[PDB]
Structure formats: C-alpha cells, structure tokens
Amino acid sequence: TMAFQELSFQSFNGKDNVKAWIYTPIRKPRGIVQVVHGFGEHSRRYLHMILKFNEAGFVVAADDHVGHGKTAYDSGNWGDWGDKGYMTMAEDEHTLRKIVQEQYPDLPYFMFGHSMGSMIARGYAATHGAGLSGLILCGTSGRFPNASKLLPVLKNLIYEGKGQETDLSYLEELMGWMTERIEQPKTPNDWISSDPDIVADHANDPFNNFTTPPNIRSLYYFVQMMEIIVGTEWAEKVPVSIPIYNIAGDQDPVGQYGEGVYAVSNWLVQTGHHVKTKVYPGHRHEIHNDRDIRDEVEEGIISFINGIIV
Ligand SMILES: [Cl-]
Ligand SMILES: [Cl-]
Ligand SMILES: [Cl-]
Ligand SMILES: [Cl-]
Ligand SMILES: [Cl-]
Ligand SMILES: [Cl-]
Ligand SMILES: [Cl-]
Ligand SMILES: [Cl-]
C-alpha cells in the first residue's frame, strides 16, 4: 500500500509519456477524486485543493495531459497532442483511473475537471462514465464562441495535409475575444482572474504554456472537445446515476458569463440528471484559485462529495 506516488504511463497517442501523481490521505480513505486540469496549465497548480481533498479522506489522482506540464517538459512536446484523435486526453484519464482503482478498488470515484479539464470530464462521462459516483465541473463552457465555425476549417487543413503545421491566427480567432468585458486589460489572459497576482503567477509558471501554440490538428481536437459535449444530445449519453456539481464565476467568458454554465446544468436536468450549480458573482475564470473564495469553493466541492458518499 503506497502513499504519495510519482508515476508515468504511455499516452493513448502512442508517443508521449504522461506524468502523473497519486496523493493519499492519512485517514482511512473514503473516496477517490481524479483532478483534470485545463488548457495551458498543469496539475501541480492544484496542490492546495488536492491537500484539502486528502484531509477530507480522499485519494487524489492527477496527470499532466499530453502537451502540458511535466509531460510536455520531459518530452519537449508542447504543441502536438498526436495523431490519435480528440479522445486522446479522455483515454489518458481512463488509464490513470484504472491505475488508482487497482490500488483502491472499492472506493467511490469522482472526477473533477476545470475548463478544458471539464470538457474532458464531460466527454469522459459520456464514454467511460460507468462507475462514477459524481462529476464536478469548474469553469465549463456552453456553446463556445467561434468553435463551431473553426471545426470545418481546421478539418479541411488536416485533409490538405497541414495538421502538423502551426498557425497562431486560428487560436487568436478562438480565444482572442475573451477580455471583451475587461476595461484596459493588462494582458490577453486577464480573463483568468480579476486578481492580477494570479494572472502573473500563471504567466511566470514554467509548467504553464501560453507561448507555444498547438498545431492545427491539436486545435482541431480542442474544438472537437468543445462541440461534442453541447446540448441534450451530449447530456443523454451521461448516466443519470452520476450527480453533477457545476461551478463557475459569472465574469468568466468561457461559460458565457454564467449563462452557458446554467445552460449546461439545464441540458443535464432536462435529461433527468441530479444537478447542483453554484455561480460565484463577480469572479472570472479561476474561482478555485481566487483567494477570497478559494476555501468556500473547495468546501462546496467536498460537501457535494460527502453528500453522495453518505
Ligand atoms: Cl505505460
Ligand atoms: Cl493528527
Ligand atoms: Cl491558506
Ligand atoms: Cl478500496
Ligand atoms: Cl461549444
Ligand atoms: Cl495530421
Ligand atoms: Cl492581470
Ligand atoms: Cl438549447
């Protein structure tokens, strides 16, 4: 029975070695939470939350996805998620799940995802959702602006053989609008948080990446992940046995400023799911890092999980 673990497994893409960690509670384990990070960040930003989960009695598993964090640093690959399709990241989450459940086979299992991590987790719940006791979505998207238009454009560029080329202009089309509500934004990433210190730390963390853009096929995957989880057509694929906790800030462009977050909740409720939502007024994207609400955000996640375990 191992406690803290630092591990690696081969990616579904067949080339990257995914770096991952397992963090165990000192108390008798009561559950497992798998933490799925978002675009351009990495899993060790989540240490504060992970430790809180451990103190609640939860085992925590998290990896740095392909193209991200220590996985990207050790491989030198920041821009290419590979040639195996948009399911790659969900499949790598599945590999990590099987590792941690082999160690802890009888515990209730929960998946937490923030931003692209919530997109991965939503797709995961529709493809590998059996056995999930609960799903936590943070900073999630409704219909994400420009995603549906770029999807055929990028698909064509792949068919024309340009999938491994990099064109920053498509990423700017997809994400350049996100500071639209902010007066005099000091950086294009000010939508991350209204605390400039959080934005600056994100910029200065060498395991984050907003410097090397994804290549065309990886951007295609990203927009595929955005679009495959839209609507009741997606929500019906998620077993109603999985309760959902859906949280965001209402100044977050990723979730259309609260409206897209509640649209996701509605798609799920309309298809028979048990959903609990909390939108934090006046906060941008990273509600779980904003220091004035971080403890409340974490306690809410833990309360949701505890309500399911017993
Ligand atoms: Cl392996
Ligand atoms: Cl003690
Ligand atoms: Cl603290
Ligand atoms: Cl167990
Ligand atoms: Cl979308
Ligand atoms: Cl390609
Ligand atoms: Cl800032
Ligand atoms: Cl709709």
Side-chain angles (χ1 to χ4, degrees), residues 1-158 160-310:
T1 175
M2 226 90 254
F4 176 55
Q5 296 162 64
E6 185 158 63
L7 60 129
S8 172
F9 58 87
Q10 185 172 254
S11 171
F12 183 82
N13 70 15
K15 51 177 173 63
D16 293 284
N17 283 320
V18 174
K19 306 299 174 167
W21 296 266
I22 294 172
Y23 307 87
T24 56
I26 64 165
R27 303 287 174 236
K28 181 172 183 276
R30 299 194 297 119
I32 301 163
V33 185
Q34 188 159 329
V35 167
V36 186
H37 72 75
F39 180 86
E41 60 160 359
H42 65 98
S43 71
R44 286 186 293 179
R45 291 188 85 206
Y46 289 83
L47 294 178
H48 187 269
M49 178 188 289
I50 293 169
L51 294 190
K52 289 286 198 68
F53 289 160
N54 287 158
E55 291 313 294
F58 308 146
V59 177
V60 179
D63 68 78
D64 288 356
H65 317 327
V66 294
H68 291 76
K70 194 179 195 230
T71 298
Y73 179 74
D74 285 353
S75 69
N77 173 28
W78 294 89
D80 179 31
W81 304 355
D83 69 357
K84 295 300 193 305
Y86 75 90
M87 283 294 300
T88 292
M89 285 169 180
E91 291 298 326
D92 289 341
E93 294 313 301
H94 198 51
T95 298
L96 178 55
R97 175 182 175 182
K98 289 188 286 186
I99 292 170
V100 64
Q101 283 196 297
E102 179 176 4
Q103 301 180 17
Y104 298 97
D106 302 317
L107 296 180
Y109 174 83
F110 299 83
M111 184 170 275
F112 167 94
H114 166 69
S115 201
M116 181 185 76
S118 78
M119 303 173 194
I120 294 164
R122 285 167 63 187
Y124 185 92
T127 56
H128 294 287
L132 264 56
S133 284
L135 175 69
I136 301 99
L137 307 175
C138 186
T140 207
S141 52
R143 301 189 159 88
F144 191 96
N146 299 321
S148 59
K149 296 272 184 307
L150 286 169
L151 193 56
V153 180
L154 297 168
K155 181 170 166 56
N156 179 246
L157 294 168
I158 295 166
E160 296 181 342
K162 298 170 187 181
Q164 275 179 100
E165 298 174 14
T166 295
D167 191 329
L168 184 53
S169 74
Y170 294 111
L171 187 61
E172 280 159 353
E173 189 164 350
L174 184 64
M175 297 179 58
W177 59 273
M178 297 176 74
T179 61
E180 60 184 354
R181 281 194 181 194
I182 303 167
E183 282 303 322
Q184 320 167 331
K186 51 196 100 58
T187 86
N189 299 295
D190 282 7
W191 53 269
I192 283 175
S193 169
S194 62
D195 185 352
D197 293 347
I198 288 173
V199 179
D201 169 84
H202 177 281
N204 293 332
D205 180 342
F207 291 91
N208 294 334
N209 171 40
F210 276 68
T211 295
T212 296
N215 59 21
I216 283 168
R217 65 181 178 194
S218 303
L219 197 64
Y220 180 57
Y221 297 167
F222 195 15
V223 296
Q224 287 189 286
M225 299 158 64
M226 290 177 172
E227 290 286 286
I228 198 72
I229 60 181
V230 171
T232 55
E233 172 163 25
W234 159 72
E236 282 192 338
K237 299 177 184 169
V238 178
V240 294
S241 59
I242 305 164
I244 303 106
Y245 188 45
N246 191 12
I247 62 177
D250 74 4
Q251 304 300 319
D252 182 10
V254 172
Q256 298 66 61
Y257 311 106
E259 184 183 348
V261 177
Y262 268 109
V264 169
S265 291
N266 283 340
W267 296 332
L268 288 161
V269 176
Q270 288 164 15
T271 52
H273 298 82
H274 188 274
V275 181
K276 183 182 212 75
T277 308
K278 184 162 172 202
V279 173
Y280 290 84
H283 289 265
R284 300 186 190 157
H285 182 54
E286 294 188 355
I287 49 158
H288 60 296
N289 291 327
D290 283 353
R291 298 305 202 259
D292 53 331
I293 61 167
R294 175 168 71 173
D295 293 316
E296 177 180 2
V297 170
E298 295 168 344
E299 291 164 8
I301 298 166
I302 292 167
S303 184
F304 167 79
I305 291 162
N306 281 336
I308 293 165
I309 296 175
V310 167

